[PDB]
Amino acid sequence: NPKFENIAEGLRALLARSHVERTTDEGTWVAGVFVYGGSKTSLYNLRRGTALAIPQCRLTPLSRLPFGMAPGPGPQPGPLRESIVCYFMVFLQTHIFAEVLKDAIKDLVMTKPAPTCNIRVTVCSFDDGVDLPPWFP
Amino acid sequence: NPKFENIAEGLRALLARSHVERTTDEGTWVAGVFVYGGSKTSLYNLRRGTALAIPQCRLTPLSRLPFGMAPGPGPQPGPLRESIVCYFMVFLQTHIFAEVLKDAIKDLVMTKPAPTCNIRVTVCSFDDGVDLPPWFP
Amino acid sequence: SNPKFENIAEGLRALLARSHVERTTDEGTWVAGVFVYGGSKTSLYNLRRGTALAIPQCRLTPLSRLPFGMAPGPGPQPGPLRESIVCYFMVFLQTHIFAEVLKDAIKDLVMTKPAPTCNIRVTVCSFDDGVDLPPWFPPM
Amino acid sequence: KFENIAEGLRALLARSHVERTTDEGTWVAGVFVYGGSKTSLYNLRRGTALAIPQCRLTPLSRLPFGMAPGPGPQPGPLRESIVCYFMVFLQTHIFAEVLKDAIKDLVMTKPAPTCNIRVTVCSFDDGVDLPPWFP
Amino acid sequence: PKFENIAEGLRALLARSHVERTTDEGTWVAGVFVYGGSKTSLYNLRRGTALAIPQCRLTPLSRLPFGMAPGPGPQPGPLRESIVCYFMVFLQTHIFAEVLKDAIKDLVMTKPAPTCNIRVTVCSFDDGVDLPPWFPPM
Amino acid sequence: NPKFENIAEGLRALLARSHVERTTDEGTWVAGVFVYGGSKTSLYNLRRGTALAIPQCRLTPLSRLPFGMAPGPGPQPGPLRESIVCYFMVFLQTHIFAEVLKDAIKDLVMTKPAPTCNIRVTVCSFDDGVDLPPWFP
């Protein structure tokens, strides 16, 4: 139940502003939504909420982002150094639904208190798709 | 670490075939390379590889991939259901180097024994960039 | 009366209203349909009860089971009679164009719903020589 | 009676040289078979399976009513008749036409209720994704 | 028995297309790759093919490895063997390989499972296959 | 048993002369390399060596070849008669790699003593592909 379900319905309502295909005949994972920032807890609930709102997506677990640039060129962190900023990924079978989900998430968090309103999202596109392992039950 | 530097040397030779811009003044994380499959340890080895070869990039830790589709109608895996297939993400400031690193990684692993040769990779693009935090700590 | 059914019926009605196409002919012939399958047994049945309520101009099979398709590779294949637990039902319609409209409606409707309802598939079908469903007179 | 029908059909199918399967493996066509009696459709079903390993069959089920003979009232969409049917899935339209003819040609040589069986070809715009068998 | 029945099937079908089966050169430049079905049905088809076509050469049955595992996980070894069998037919002409493939596909099509599950593809050898010369042993 | 490993490396180095794809997205087995002659043992080690060099290929087991043409007027062999000459087949996904592997095997055995130098190889192509049985572990 909530916070997950309330986030779930929140998104469902926004996703409904658009009429767009969520799936393709190909079945390939060519689109995605990269969601990061806020706090671990705020990302956690948004994630769970997203799973309930969109059965046709696939989600990474939570994980942590590396650092970015300086300035002061002295020096940059290793490419391996990890911040405390968390993220997760949404795989989608269409680009257009991925925009709708981006907007949905951006519109939904901007009405929330911190840290949830500090959550950032962008569409990502995968040149060759991502071949998620098939499920055989 | 033998196995890491042999990898880094592999990648370097290959990346050397193509001297493309790796950085921009903007410093923006707009491109990436999405690496997955193989085994957990070979993947980790490749991630450590890339770290030493390419100081201009940033890397996530390993995490898990969800499942893709179930064949046929009827039951599909949850969005949150997680496989044992691992992935990591490489952030890059330019799209052309993302293309080059994908080509390098693919050309490198295909000549290697399994399971390393079963690693997959695709460029990815971030519509509005990824604001990785600034480093200092 | 049966919320789960009337909810579904209201869903379809809302969507069908997007396109007020001819649903019947003077001919009265069943030349088209909609083939609805997958999901779960209970979700599919629920969709069938809702479709009944929304569209008095159609006729519905009960649920039954689908056979298996192809086995991958050059090995043994399922018998033509082998039955899976995947269910289906068919909708008979007197026009091809309302069949198209109804397929879009079912599809648009279930894609917003939770699993397993969202895993229901549908396709228009059409019958080269019509289907001569039997005439009905109250028995009773 | 299963094994006389099977051959009844193979002999007619043998008149035609048409592909039964594709590389896609998709189920894009069917033959919709109904009427007669339950038993007459049941034997023909069992028979079709023996004749054609490349097809897939629904079990027997019941058909709903059509239109009222007059005014009416009209039947509900749900009311079920005692008339039976089954579906044959096929990977090619052309085979479906050939199997339709074979079935029509075979039953018209039998006594009632078998000669009252009806069949038409049906085409699925998008295919029917029958579940894969591993098992 | 089951062999001569197959042989007659192939015979009747090949007669459709009266193509050159042999060459002056006597080189083995084409094939027909027959697999699937069951081991016993495949074997029957091989014995029948031998009886119908004296101008061809046949391997014994042997097994096929697996192809691809789906997804990005573990794959089967190059050496891993399945229970699917195959055999190969060597032919001296590419056009008879096409026709024999057509005949084999047309024949199994009509047959019960598992025979109807046998697949077949033409194949082409770029440099031929130098099958050894035969002389009757002592 | 290290006999395998040295042939493995023998091939890996020759294959490296050419950068070509070993796999396609279709994943269809449309190319092959047909290897025969020498001796059963010479073929056996080359086979094992081949598997080690090319994790992307698939190998039939060893088997034996039928005979070809009679010399001169004499009676022909029956289509069934088996010789003592052995063979094996290499399934590949691309024609171009098949060529590469054919040259590599030819180049590798031409340097060895008999009977290994008597091993013969030709590329083959499969009009319709070979539907190898998929693998579910």
Short mmCIF file of C-alpha atoms in Angstrom, two decimals, chain D residues 38-109:
data_model
loop_
_atom_site.label_atom_id
_atom_site.label_comp_id
_atom_site.label_asym_id
_atom_site.label_seq_id
_atom_site.Cartn_x
_atom_site.Cartn_y
_atom_site.Cartn_z
CA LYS D 38 -21.24 -32.31 -31.26
CA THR D 39 -20.08 -35.80 -32.02
CA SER D 40 -19.81 -35.17 -35.74
CA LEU D 41 -17.57 -32.14 -35.08
CA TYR D 42 -15.65 -34.05 -32.44
CA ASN D 43 -14.65 -36.91 -34.81
CA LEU D 44 -13.70 -34.39 -37.50
CA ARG D 45 -11.59 -32.48 -35.02
CA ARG D 46 -9.74 -35.61 -33.94
CA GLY D 47 -9.48 -36.48 -37.60
CA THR D 48 -8.08 -33.06 -38.62
CA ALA D 49 -5.30 -33.42 -36.05
CA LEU D 50 -4.17 -36.80 -37.44
CA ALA D 51 -4.25 -35.45 -40.92
CA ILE D 52 -2.36 -32.24 -40.23
CA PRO D 53 0.49 -32.15 -37.67
CA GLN D 54 1.33 -28.56 -38.65
CA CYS D 55 -2.04 -27.13 -37.42
CA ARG D 56 -3.28 -26.41 -33.86
CA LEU D 57 -6.84 -26.95 -32.66
CA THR D 58 -9.07 -25.35 -30.11
CA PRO D 59 -11.11 -27.77 -28.06
CA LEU D 60 -14.75 -27.99 -28.89
CA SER D 61 -16.90 -25.14 -27.56
CA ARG D 62 -20.38 -23.62 -28.15
CA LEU D 63 -21.54 -20.83 -30.37
CA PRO D 64 -23.77 -17.93 -29.34
CA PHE D 65 -26.93 -17.04 -31.15
CA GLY D 66 -27.24 -14.69 -34.08
CA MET D 67 -30.30 -12.56 -34.79
CA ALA D 68 -33.86 -13.03 -33.69
CA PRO D 69 -36.02 -14.67 -36.41
CA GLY D 70 -38.21 -11.53 -36.28
CA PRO D 71 -39.05 -8.47 -34.01
CA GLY D 72 -37.43 -9.90 -31.72
CA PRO D 73 -36.36 -9.68 -28.73
CA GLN D 74 -32.68 -10.06 -29.57
CA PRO D 75 -30.48 -12.58 -27.75
CA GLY D 76 -27.97 -11.27 -25.15
CA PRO D 77 -24.35 -11.35 -26.35
CA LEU D 78 -23.70 -14.08 -23.76
CA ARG D 79 -26.47 -16.62 -24.49
CA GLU D 80 -25.02 -19.88 -25.80
CA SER D 81 -26.58 -22.27 -28.30
CA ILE D 82 -26.17 -25.99 -28.48
CA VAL D 83 -24.38 -25.55 -31.82
CA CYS D 84 -20.66 -26.41 -31.59
CA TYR D 85 -17.44 -25.16 -33.17
CA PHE D 86 -13.74 -25.43 -33.22
CA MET D 87 -10.89 -23.42 -34.59
CA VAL D 88 -7.85 -24.59 -36.59
CA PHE D 89 -4.82 -22.32 -36.52
CA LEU D 90 -2.50 -22.34 -39.55
CA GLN D 91 0.65 -20.44 -40.49
CA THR D 92 -0.49 -19.63 -44.04
CA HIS D 93 -3.63 -18.29 -45.67
CA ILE D 94 -3.25 -20.52 -48.71
CA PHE D 95 -3.24 -23.72 -46.67
CA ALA D 96 -6.31 -22.48 -44.81
CA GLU D 97 -8.15 -22.18 -48.11
CA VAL D 98 -7.03 -25.68 -49.04
CA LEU D 99 -8.10 -27.14 -45.71
CA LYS D 100 -11.45 -25.34 -45.93
CA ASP D 101 -12.09 -26.93 -49.32
CA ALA D 102 -10.88 -30.31 -48.12
CA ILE D 103 -13.28 -30.21 -45.19
CA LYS D 104 -16.21 -28.93 -47.29
CA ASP D 105 -15.45 -31.53 -49.95
CA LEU D 106 -15.20 -34.37 -47.45
CA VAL D 107 -18.37 -33.65 -45.38
CA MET D 108 -20.66 -33.21 -48.40
CA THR D 109 -20.09 -36.89 -49.17
#
